[model samples]
Target chain A: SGFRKMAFPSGKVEGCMVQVTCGTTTLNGLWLDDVVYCPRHVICTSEDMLNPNYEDLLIRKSNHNFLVQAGNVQLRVIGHSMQNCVLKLKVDTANPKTPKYKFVRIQPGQTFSVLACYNGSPSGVYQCAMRPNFTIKGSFLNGSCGSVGFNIDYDCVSFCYMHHMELPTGVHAGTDLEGNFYGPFVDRQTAQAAGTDTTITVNVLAWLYAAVINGDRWFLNRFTTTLNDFNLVAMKYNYEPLTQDHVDILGPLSAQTGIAVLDMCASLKELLQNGMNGRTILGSALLEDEFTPFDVVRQCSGVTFQ
Target chain B: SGFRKMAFPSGKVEGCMVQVTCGTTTLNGLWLDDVVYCPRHVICTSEDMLNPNYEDLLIRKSNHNFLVQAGNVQLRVIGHSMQNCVLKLKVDTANPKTPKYKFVRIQPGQTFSVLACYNGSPSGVYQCAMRPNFTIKGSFLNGSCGSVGFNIDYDCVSFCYMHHMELPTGVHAGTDLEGNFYGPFVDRQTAQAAGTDTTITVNVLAWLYAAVINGDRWFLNRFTTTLNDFNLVAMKYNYEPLTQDHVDILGPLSAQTGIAVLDMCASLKELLQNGMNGRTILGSALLEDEFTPFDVVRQCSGVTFQ
Candidate 1:
């Protein structure tokens, strides 16, 4: 049977069984000067009135490539520490060169702002090392201070080269608090076809809209300066899906060939002109046909969530 | 005043004021086809049955150097997007070189274990850049996956040299999941006086214990191999507080002088023994005093927590 005990409320000392669980071990003992003590097993620190030593044991669950689960289930320090003794939940025992780190909670597509103190001078700093989703981890008191959720005044948050990601298709590009579109939102497939997949940064359909899809000079200007990987990769997915008129004109040359193919109306409707479902790149001008309705054998495959 | 309305609950649609709050402005519009419509204002998107455009406005409260609030108080998307249109919660409006990033929540002294994919490869990796406090932030799906709370079993977590910190006075050193003690802990004051503050990584007095403070070759063995700033800085704090016997040998020559002041007996008791409060470094070997108490003019400064 596992160790479990309920605390008996007020004044009935005799009814209360001292149950403090340290890892899986339970100390069915008594408290003497703020410590749970058992004559059979000493599962705490400072056995006597005048000695503060390491904790009885450091619990472990399993091992990973670089991570360690300190406790299998939980680690709770109840009661108070002995006089003049600081409660050190975890201890660094050896002089081994092993680095220790941890991850903290944050919303996706977030940037970190910290009160960075370099030597003696302090300044507000923003960094996107945690971008494309993954915020900062570890202790803020080691030396640096932690800034979560709220970005401090000082326009300090910026995405790292590592933070560039696929702006999902069907959405507009994401912007910073400063209202700047991240570098470039390129199409992954198109870049790969051009022998440039290794460097594409964004999904054009996702990051850019028909609203302003063509900004070559602007795109070139920003990519050249932004430190994200796209600059190093040196390519992007410039976009604006083929217009119905553009696609319609191509059907003639293909008609002379043996296999002329026609896309469905629904496929053309998925593109843009004025609105996301418009006739022009920036306006709802008219009800033009999305695609030339031609008879063809077509099969579509997809699944929908309820 | 501000337009505020309450829903009547159940099936009473007439009593509900169609209340919606966007920035400081309130909307008392009616819903038509899953989208809010008002004769006076167009706060909602998709005016007609088929047009997906950018949201009307991006809110701004104030500005900073590198950080932006996105929303001062809050930003909420209540209704669903038009068919086939994905919600672009935040948009990258311009191709500005500005970068965006954010922070997440995490317990102090934690390590992040992420599924890192490199080109076409990924492996368990541990790092301490988040150490000395501060963890990752931003969109994890950009390229990397988020691994929080839970460290995977790759033993892929470690402290970067930047993570080396003061272990705190009066407590023992910390250890990794494998129960290996971190690198050498040293005394800051001592190291600073010796012109070695810039390079000292661990607080020996804090990271090490009287339990096992002396490990010169061991300290050198680890420091020489580690890659943090300390290795580049190239120096450290080696420690062992003066013992009563060690100090007792020096008072005699000073007693022959004019202004020789004696320390309090309490100072001698803080030495090492089998326990933290023992007379020897590794054993509870004595009843000897901490320091030789002599009559002197002294003013002590201290405070206590309630």
Candidate 2:
């Protein structure tokens, strides 16, 4: 009777995608239907839940590009809406000096950007690793806004509020596809695929930001393809169809691109392997640092959507 | 000491590539090599070293177009030339009265050819389940060439032999490149690359085999492309450097008759898949009975070094 009571508890933290096991107990009894977990409080995720510390680290072969930067580069994923989440970054650099990284919190339906800086000697292969320094916080999602580097497994087609339901908020200060006041999901795809008939927005933004300064144009092309095409394709039908303006802007861009140029898909795929994408927008740094140069300052702001 | 003496008991029937557990009253002192124990009378295999009963079955795909008819298949290696190895055949048929299959014996020094008669049913997949059925006899190259079906992992590199060796009597066929009068190690590339200024020798046999019976013609129009003027410059070096006569034969065939109809690389790639090219030619059959039709009657003679 004692063993039965301890083994079979009444309350269950339902999961929809993966089997969530804790100690001797396993979760995910009710899945694929609804996200109906009783919210007690926003908690931080523990490292124990994130086992096998490193997920996948692959240097995908491209007919046209190299994946990693040639020098010390820093990037991270910021979570403004969810507090106290830890993000871990590790890199297998061929050189001695390694890049630094940190995690931040961005609000729901807000826009953010990934920042990378490099100072190097010569060219060689480097290994980049990513993992979630997660807090025990509950997952957050928005219908319109999305993220590029979040550790969300949407392919699972389940209702896990933490991993799968955790979607990115869209552009900051701009209206989303649903005409919602909140910023849209500022994912890699939305950023690269965001364009208009009159002006190619994604192209303009990418060219302006010069996101790939390492001459990794081919990889950037592929990243743009994924971010614009696959991510938009996967998310377009998930909610309501994009508005006429959104369609007019993104349609031509999507068509011109193949499976190679999407950034959202690339980030998602990389996260699926390494738990997260190692890039982030430091909102506080923009407001705090006054002595930073003008061009660098503008770049930091342009990438920062919100 | 006792275990080693007991394992090797004076005179015992053992084979090469076989392993035995010898004991020295110490855990790590056991001597296990095929060299010390292989006896002349027994055929040895590497199976004993792997496990007592190791059978790991995996379902894979196969293409049926390459199955031999029942008599033309042959196996050869560097040493211990064996002749007249037989294999049983079973054809899957729809009608109750007319089942397909028979037994066949392959000849030495000849290559096996798969015919279109065994193209198999399109709807369902089939596999041949084979096991060793006869006594362990003849020279075993590594082991006897009595494998049930073709598999690479279970079998090591498919070919084995000594560097400089003598041939036995009655096995006097020669190889194309090495000029060894025992083997006909005629692989596809070397076969086509054998003769310098070699032409299809059909002055005597051309008229006899010229008639097209099943959409197959014999010694029809010959096309040639000389080394200087051979077109398809995109991949010129991929083909054999042609002589003037070879060019005369290949040019017209390439340009007009469409010998370039099938892409060589694509067709060669299909060999890795079980599609038509990588066929397991079991053997061939001859229709010589009274019930055999006049048009389809064939002789029992197997393949020979042509």
Candidate 3:
């Protein structure tokens, strides 16, 4: 008896349950626009789970980065080369050099639909941009432009894909909670001297297993769009210490990112206990000698909420 | 007894009585930030009584449209063509194509200051625009651009001066109740078949004496910026009748636009009784044959407030 009874809405399926693959799929009266999938890791009704049209599931291939979502708009595309492109869509409600361009075109293939609306809860941040211009084998080029932000909510929508390439010079790549990829490191002190036993607890158990099987927040904006590979492979554990291999990689991502998956695994164990209490008050202000090590490595790195 | 008791504040002056000219000027406290002018116009606290800086009382010289207020913003200038010009200013807030341009210059006498705040009553329509370029003798021109709207209230602001030139081929100009200057009338059906005896009640007592002596709503946006002289000069009294020379043109615009002059003579006697009940339901829909006289001359022009 794995579990069944699904009535839904305990603030969107409290602590998950709706995996009816053959228990006779019946969510009789939850009435949230006739519900759907919410089992593997579960806040199902906060709405988001509609994607499925990778040009009719040919699945993957088209490195033109997209993050499409429909109702309450969120369309974005950021392809840089492989030619013939220019897609400029703009709109930012307040201050940012007054934006309201709406559309600009030049293409071979690009798609979008935007109308974004909100007022009750979710607010601000909508920004948009995409640019590409190419010719190839005959040369014309002038690509590479990016801008994106959505933060929309209320009856949300979702879709995503971000693939790009350009990495071969003093390499740096990662992924592993056994999803194996590993890197080249040459930095971050040789990827933190290669240990949290074999590379920073296998890269935060592969970024908490790709944010629990992607109930997509654009995989945390594509795992923090590489700021030098998120400061040399995720701030080399910015003061680690919450192991049992990060609680056994939150047991299959709490059955896959939902019902706020144990409230995002208790907020990643209180963000590793407040990044180990600000790295033990910055190693007691560098052993009390008027702090240094460039002021504790230029004022530490991650974990900040307040 | 030219009236004078003054110890104000009966909600910014009640049942009015102030006019004393030589008894040692004193307001004492009608409380509207220590009074200015108000005898019957009623709600005088919503400020506005500045008007007295005619570029050092030069009075009448420039006709390049203006709507300055200075303080909580409302500066406008619209001049289109004469030589080497460019002027654009924008800001609407609460969305209207993400406005807030602030300034765009290329000039020869242009000015502005915009912050625009409202609500304690008045709302919307704040729009702005201006364009000018002059060389004068050589002949290189393209000017006649105009756009303006204010409405705004609550501790208001005021200023006016719009005097344009070009009107040779089939002319039209107006202003009456003594601020003399009538029209040329070659059109608007020979100026509404010249009624209100010698042209539409002298063009609505010259647009209600240029909007109650310019407390500036851009003289009802420059007396209906033309659509056949705003439908034959404001529908020449849509179904007329309201004499006593419109009650002696409100006794000297209640001593020159102040104290809300009998609250604008009981709101122009409820705007001529809702413009004679919508001009007798549009003359019984033009005698029951269902509209047309080119749909009542393309929907009679403007003037409707409540």
Candidate 4:
């Protein structure tokens, strides 16, 4: 009977949206879910990078601006409110009118953030181009707040438009839809006949992997249609239905972002590995340190998951 | 900031050891950490597999025996004590002397378990191959106990035989030894000249994938040599230390087990996915359910991680 007492335990996230330039684009209220519909960098940190000693490190937050100042080199969250998280983030050397920011989704009573860092001084085109780093959180549903580095997962729902819960099991018509499974219909008419929306729900990373990063036009077109279905429309998670100028933003959001970025997801996964025995050393330092700088832009957490 | 209240949370291991037959092999003192040094099947359960509803499902255990009886077809922990967690297990129709069991390493003050379930009547090489399942905790250093499915990570250190913490950085010795890295020495004399043991420490799964499962002779040879370095030998984690009689078992342990099994790691990764936003639905059902059925036998918890 000495054995009776034993037992117990327990655990992705979207890519970090960076910009050599998201320049000249209107990024406001672009609640495109997790799918960047643009460029993404998945940083899969290897378990090798996660030092247990890192646990002793604490995460700091700021109500107004989470700032990091390495002398003249600075990164900060400049302006924000509940409705728009990524209002404006600034680095000491960025272009003033370009409005450096990200579109992160944060929900009610939830928190989020973003990092605005640069390695060296700015140059042409990538006027606010990046490299070095620091911590400065981002926009949230509750308004401007930042982090030295955030401790939250930035969830991006790809295939954000014309989608419904009734997903497919396999690539065929008659399969049962398992949770998060993505498949296609003969077309919209068949989807309507089947009483399911045609939006193919998939892992946000999967969509980015197939569509945005890899640029698979077929997957892109199949995932979201521009025909504008009555019930299924752009940015379902947005508090206000896609209305007025909001509808105009979908064009750019639908097309994949042209910027190039590294994948933090893959890096994070790699870093989490090598700790031994084929298991990952969870919560690596890369995550604890860099990832904590999330961009919780224009979000409403715990909303009905469409 | 309204987000002040918003914040946070937190985290396997080893595959399920089912057997058609270990036959007459002496598994005691095997202490072959995570690598199975043979074959392993990782059950990567998808997040979809995890039903938070499952949290409501309680895990049951018994000091004498953890059980599941579908009429006459049964699976249970038959013989166990402090010395060997997987002392002996019997399915309804196993070879009485074949000794159907796994060599799970459990440490002191830690809990573990195993399931001895069979699908139907046994025959052929596998007198008791596996199919269905249940929860039954296994051997820890203290005594006998089992869980319907225990909550624990079975850490098997592959290359378990000759490894030390002095790992390498890349494929060549020229680089620095990073944590959990693996590389090779020109030869034993070269290793001695380098002032480090020639053992290569790697993720348990990586070894299984590259050597055992894939049968990569090159990687195998590069990983461990049979020469028997002074401080390195078979089963480093054994409580009693390798002396006399135990030395006889290293031959087969180093050669690698020839068998086929699924990868729970990949499956778990897949399942923990699809919650949307390029992130994984952590703690998938596959993990929470089947994974809880960890086979922790003859282990020594929290030992110095070499």
Candidate 5:
């Protein structure tokens, strides 16, 4: 055996989301629970990692919009948080004579599901605002400042985000979800049926993206189940779940725009195909590119969250 | 030179259509000026030839029916006779109260051409009887005692030989034109247009046989022309008119049978393809069969005069 040694240089800067260098290998972007490799290097960039101010936040987008019919709609919560807090949800028709509101309390390490029903196919707008005093921490969750909001019109969900996540050092710039954040992953019936964390992650991402593009909830619900089923099949072949690092990188973009899920899920599929060896194969030129995850999301959705 | 000698006994019988065995070859049936070989051997039978009554008469048949309307029909005379004689032709409807007739004179080495025109489509049965008083010699020409006949019912001419050619020995029995002989190659317009003699032969034989089958002059005329055209093409490939030996072997079966033409033509094509050896190629069961021609024609047409 030959002795081979390698060195990794290290540096840090404020505002840099990632910044640890060992030998020639450099680590950058939002460092969550565990770092995962991005073959396309779409989720992270080395340029901003050296910056001192590079900060990666847990809740990237502050608002989301969804299409709801004249029936009960289920809201699903996903991801982890450090502190327990109450979520404020509001619903109203455009310039409504009266407003509808509800509150949801969530605890650390626990997810929740809430069903809200409305009358008539009205131009309903919904908002989920974070309580300002929670001292949210894990993965840079901020309860005091950001909020997520959405509006329902013509059977379609339109979302808006406030104070989008800043680009981290060493990661590609403009990969955020264009500032339209989604919260409490809102489709549990399928996610639970997924049976696996990785499957649940894939379903959550797929449904969120599908919901953004289509206004029909039935259509959205049907395909979400299909996507989850497909992901479960993919899991039979040893597919890996998206690590916290991926979430840290993709979280902001997904929060900023629901469509960003399309980019992330597509990337995840391709990455699995690559690492799968003889297991699975995925072929899509659109999924294999040099653009940032957020860029692909915008390109595919034909909508810029920014 | 080596000595090779052989002798054949001879005999003659009265009323015998053919006779005499010279050396090993036999001289038989209706020997006109130059005994053109009747390949069918149908005009001569060995039983009659070996019999003492060897009678040779030029007049093979005396009655024929033909289609003639608004046009002159050509009267073609084939075969030979010792002296010139008059031909008496009468035309009338099947139940005609009165019959219309005409006369034609034919001399030695000289044939007669009669253009008889008629009006309207009629069952104009024509009887061309030889004048028996002319002392008609070789192969018998009987204008008074025997007559050739014809009628016009269809677009094609129908002819009848007064005396049909008899079948010969050493051949498949029951191959005659069912004892009813046709005359003068009735489908003339097409036959005349046939540039090659081989084409003319094929057409004459085809129409004569087809006329026997459907008794439809039009259909007979149509395909006779087509066969002639195709034969003309075959002649371009150095094909010669079918020899009398071919007739003797193939007999009237092939001459009077259209299906026989198909089989023979197909075999000829296949044989040419084989012998072409780079000159031409005909793919068939012959080459496919791994057997190997004079033999091929018999194999294809199913007879050999010799």
Candidate 6:
């Protein structure tokens, strides 16, 4: 496979221009149309899609020529293969100051049936990307891109999150043809420009040696957001002889702090060099000589293998 | 490269004996005479040395001649290399509570020195084992033990660090000879015990993939000590984006907190579905998506040639 360009898979975003034909301001026919400003055909617009006046009306027909009440809006017609595709949505909720983004895994076959009456206002970009085990369709008209390895070359592939996050067009997040696993092996010139030479070293090798995040970038996001406590706490064990106390300390702290120690070995090197081995650090503030065969054995004492 | 046995290599421990000359407390004008209990001799205690020190020194030396005097007390002469060599002592005192030990890589035929000055009351056993470089030892005595594409049956040659912790009577930690270029590969296991009969997963395709401490029994002793914040903090960022704040957050809250995220894939089964692309978790508090291509662009990573 060679350089697969980002295909602008086209589709129509249809809605109706409802004018209350026989009703008294109670919305009648749905008018859904593509956003006119969009370079491609607009599949859906933010206005009517966000706040449909009726709460219980189900979407009878969606894709081709499906009508909904709409004004002259935008339409970016895209492929429906983008369903169940994991999207990273960051919303600046007026409530909390943290720019908390929910890493949601969306499975929109034709569209998300979020017409629930109880839920309040929904205002955010519903961005979707490919999830794992996804095999892209031939060309952009039928597929989603997934990059599992490091993106190396600049001119090699079509889809690349590494490129999109940098470029912001959403064009580079998918994969290109050329069968370039991830991108390329990343060289010197590109690295110098990026100023990540030192960091790339620690991360690819030492940091992500056996992490789940190393496999797929999308999964990593969900894993990090959902289990931040465990991830950070497991880091505490680092290279130390990860004991129950380490796990115990990691356990309760994870619940209370809302973060999980997702990564297990961040603290491993430290532990190997200086962690308390066998017993729990819970009983004692800093258990002395926790390093011993007894500790290693006992820490594994109650473990049951399935 | 079949089932390999790990040896610590040989080192002699000297026995201590008080010498008496004619009528004095020390032996001054003693002629060149043979000492009893030589490693090769294998002579009985009854085997006589020419005019042994007052018969008491002979009996004392025969049973114990391992100690050497620094001040008024004696220090058992443990850790004797076959050749006249000195060992360098590199200590990590960051967490003064627990210290890390590193031996200087010694070249063959070079005489080295070990410099650790302390009173003779060694609270722990003082044993030292050579770190036989498996790659240098070339399979048998000097060859690459493990590499990419090839599976090695060679024993993993590593030091037991008995002297590092002053432990007693060391046994073999088991062979650690195999590795993939990037790990999470099949680890050490018995040949017959290696495979799944129905699944047809052979020992050749297996590894101790779950926990770092799984394959080796000897490493269990390593976790006996608690990690000091020094080494603990140093390794918190083996992966990229390890910042001062990250270190600060991880320093005191190590046991109390976790840094990264883990197991949010709904189920552990899904998390470990494929042996190869298993979705475990991220280790660092540094979020990957927060990182851009620029984050990992340039750098020297782990175990580089230079």
Per TM-score, the best of the predicted structures is 4
Write model 4 residue lDDT over B99-210, tens digit each, in one string. Answer: 1223232221222222111211100000010111111111111100111112222222211111111112111111111111123332111122223221111112222232
- Model 6, retained fraction of real contacts? 0.00
For all predicted structures, in order, the TM-scores are: 0.15, 0.16, 0.14, 0.18, 0.14, 0.15
DockQ of candidate 2 compared with the true complex: 0.01
* Per-residue error (Å), model 2, residue B265: 18
Return the top candidate by lDDT.
Answer: 5
Per-candidate DockQ vs. reference: 0.01, 0.01, 0.01, 0.03, 0.00, 0.01
TM-score of chain A of 5: 0.20
Among all windows of ten consecutive residues in candidate 6 chain A, which has the lowest summed lDDT?
A115-124
Prediction 3 TM-score vs. true: 0.14
Candidate 6 overall Cα lDDT vs. reference?
0.18
Provide the lDDT at B192 for model 2: 17
* CA-lDDT, candidates in order: 0.21, 0.19, 0.20, 0.20, 0.24, 0.18
- Ranked by lDDT, the better of candidates 1 and 5 is 5
Please tell me what DockQ candidate 1 reaches. 0.01
Number of backbone collisions per candidate, in order? 102, 61, 26, 101, 100, 134
lDDT of 1 by residue, A1-306 (tens): 000010001111111113333333332222222222221112232332123132332222211111111123221333223211111122222212221212233333333322222111121122222223222221121112111112211122221111111222211122232222233432121221111112111122112111122211111111111223322222222222333443454453235322222322122223222223212221222222111111000000011000
Better model by lDDT, 5 or 6? 5
TM-score (chain B only), all candidates: 0.19, 0.18, 0.16, 0.18, 0.19, 0.17
Q: For candidate 3, lDDT tens digit of each residue in B208-237?
A: 433333222321221112223333423453
DockQ of 4: 0.03
- Please give the distance, in angstroms, between residue B166's alpha carbon in candidate 1 and its true position after superposition: 52
